[PDB]
Design a protein around this ligand. Sequence first.
Ligand SMILES: [Zn+2]
Lengths: 48, 223, 224, 122, 61, 61, 93, 97
Amino acid sequence: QKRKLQVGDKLANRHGNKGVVAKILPVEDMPHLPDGTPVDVILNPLGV
Amino acid sequence: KAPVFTVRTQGREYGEFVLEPLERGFGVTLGNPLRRILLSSIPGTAVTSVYIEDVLHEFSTIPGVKEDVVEIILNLKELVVRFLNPSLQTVTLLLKAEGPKEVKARDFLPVADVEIMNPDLHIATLEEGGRLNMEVRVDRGVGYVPAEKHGIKDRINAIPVDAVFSPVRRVAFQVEDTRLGQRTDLDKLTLRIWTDGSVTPLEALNQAVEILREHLTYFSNPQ
Amino acid sequence: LKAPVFTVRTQGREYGEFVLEPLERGFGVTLGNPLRRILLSSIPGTAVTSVYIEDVLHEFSTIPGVKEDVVEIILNLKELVVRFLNPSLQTVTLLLKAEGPKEVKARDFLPVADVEIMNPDLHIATLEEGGRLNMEVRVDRGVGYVPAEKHGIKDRINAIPVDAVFSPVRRVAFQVEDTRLGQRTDLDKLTLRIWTDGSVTPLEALNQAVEILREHLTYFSNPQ
Amino acid sequence: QVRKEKKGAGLEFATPEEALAAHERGEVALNAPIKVAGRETSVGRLKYVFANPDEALLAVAHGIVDLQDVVTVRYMGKRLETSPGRILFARIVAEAVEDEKVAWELIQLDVPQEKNSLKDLV
Amino acid sequence: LEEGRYLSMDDVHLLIKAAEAGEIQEVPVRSPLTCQTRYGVCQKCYGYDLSMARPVSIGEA
Amino acid sequence: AARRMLERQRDIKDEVWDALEEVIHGKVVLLNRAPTLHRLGIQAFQPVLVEGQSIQLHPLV
Amino acid sequence: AEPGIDKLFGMVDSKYRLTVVVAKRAQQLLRHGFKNTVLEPEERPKMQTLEGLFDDPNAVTWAMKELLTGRLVFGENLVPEDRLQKEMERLYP
Amino acid sequence: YDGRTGEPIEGPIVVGQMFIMKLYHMVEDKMHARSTGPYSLITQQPLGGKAQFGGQRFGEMEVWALEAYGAAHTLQEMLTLKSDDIEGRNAAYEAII
Ligand SMILES: [Zn+2]
């Protein structure tokens, strides 16, 4: 079957920053750049 | 003086609109409110389900066919169509070519009303004697819809897909300064929208604004 | 599906509980933010323009026979609320002078034409024996909050422009929580709470808002 | 937290009467900023006078002053010079709990909140 | 500070402060190490502490 | 009767759900971390219908 | 948190007391029929889409609300043991 | 810009294209939701495997904490009505239904 990333999904970076996936806000109310093109993923700086 | 609603349409895709002058930072109380709906309410078109002759599951592959199932299926949702009547709530096209050739979306069999604004879309390619046979179900719903949420069964061995309506690529609003009026603390809202092809900027515009209006009435009967 | 049920819970004439749900995905916000923007920046009302007293010269002084400082008084003013009858009152001047031991309320002002001080029992200042106190404050009609240093209205060159406290709407705090509905739970529960000084009940408050909003949308007709 | 701009010059108001005006005039120009090293208060806490807490927000969210800008506002019955961010925190806690009296009676609106500040608060 | 009183955090401070002046170094208080109750102990011998802050509810594990 | 009603239904009646919530109402469940060393290793909470397949937990706990 | 939970703890001589009291009255409310309440007139517990929470919501939810009012009385040996389900089943259908 | 309220966030927000990836550990291997099912053919434990599932263990650790709380009944409930004593189990099922 296909594994379409949902909620309980977890993903990390090549740098070792692992983390689950909480809510998946729609592109609608998603922080966007002054010229359209909204964001994709929001990481919390506190983990830096 | 009244806020002039101008338009600078440039084709079927791009669509810029200007609204000025505007009160104390009102352009913002409009740019976002509308924009939001503009990308989550505007109804579009997409591929609902498909059924290939020589196929059982979406994780298979057909001889003589370069790209595998999933590969093509993906290039399908990338397609865009345009209906010409509120009745075309459910339309299904079909296509099947053979021998060496680029499987373009255009190669489909025209279905009068409904039109395809996505001609060049390279869906797949057939080597030699590629048994290309499918059933492309198309619907005009709203927003995104999980392929495992609707479960379209046009045929016993057909596999549904995901909704890719919302004829909006990206929207943005600019709340520049004023141009007229003895007051400089005014606004000039101007939004630029992009549509896949189904509905032109204007179309999308009116719609959203209307959905808004209608909503405003719900605040009638108190408690 | 089911049309959102607009309920309310108004307590008096200042608090305002409003509940409108359910609502599609991310719509309560598409309604909360806009409203709030107008709910406190476009609402018409009354406010204290500029104040003036003879014996006064600077905003940082003290009048004998009066405990409250210049600012304390002027501040007690902006607070005060009034009400005009017909739109033919874009400007109204209110005067007031009193002496000797006594409490100086807003109801002490001299009754003018189609104007009412719904805020009588306001403690503006208290004078003691020989408390020479007289002033002439000006009030007009505007919208939202406008700093005193902004408009800069100067009847008498030695008068003092005061901040703008029009929109009788004290503040608002929307809420977009997710409610349930059997099949789907990721819904919307938009709840707006409005506050007012009393000039107008939360009810009307929102009405004019939406009304103005709608009208503005009407300007989306004649192309060019 | 509040912000400390650069002092254009030793803004002395502890004595210059005209300072309330003059020293502030220079502020009107390009001399002393909003939150300068005010003598008994920076110009910021002087130009903007707020009676009821609510008055603050308004101007604040309107784009006038920020939350970390020193200003003046009257509360229970005193004209305290602080900032929106501070005053807000008040109305917050005083709201989460009915009795507003005891509310601001057990907090420190004169020091940037931090772990411990809260810990004790709770 | 009457006997049996359950000294709260605040009380402790006055204790520290007083001690600083060199007024007291010791503190007479009940503790499980002197409880007569055969098996288990008494509210008094134990103390305040609990999921709350007030005296411990009789019969706590 | 109700057992078979949902013995297998990719179309769980809308009524069913509303009922479920109507079942819990006040009743509360319990949460437990794997390594339980302290009492609070398990706290009581009032569950409510949610999406996703994961359990939503408050940040404070 | 729970409704006036504090006012409760203050009515009992021990935390654990409350529990046993809330539980015992909670049962008697459902077993001995759901009409033994004492605050049924007004301010009675309610539901949502349908305020039908006027008949059978949740046991304890009612039990505590009952203690909210000093209408009831509790203790170690108040009423005779057996004389419990005898005076209750006969007074309520 | 926010997008939710349209009011941009005061203060630039460092952006870019970071490289992420999903891991082997999915949510499939974790989703145990049991209530009524099989039982240990040997002892008497709610083990599933086929049509139903099996309720996670309780361990003495968790119990202890439970003991601490003083949840005598909640605890006794887990050591009996929800495990061994099959009588109270069904007896309970009836009362519930
Ligand atoms: Zn003892």
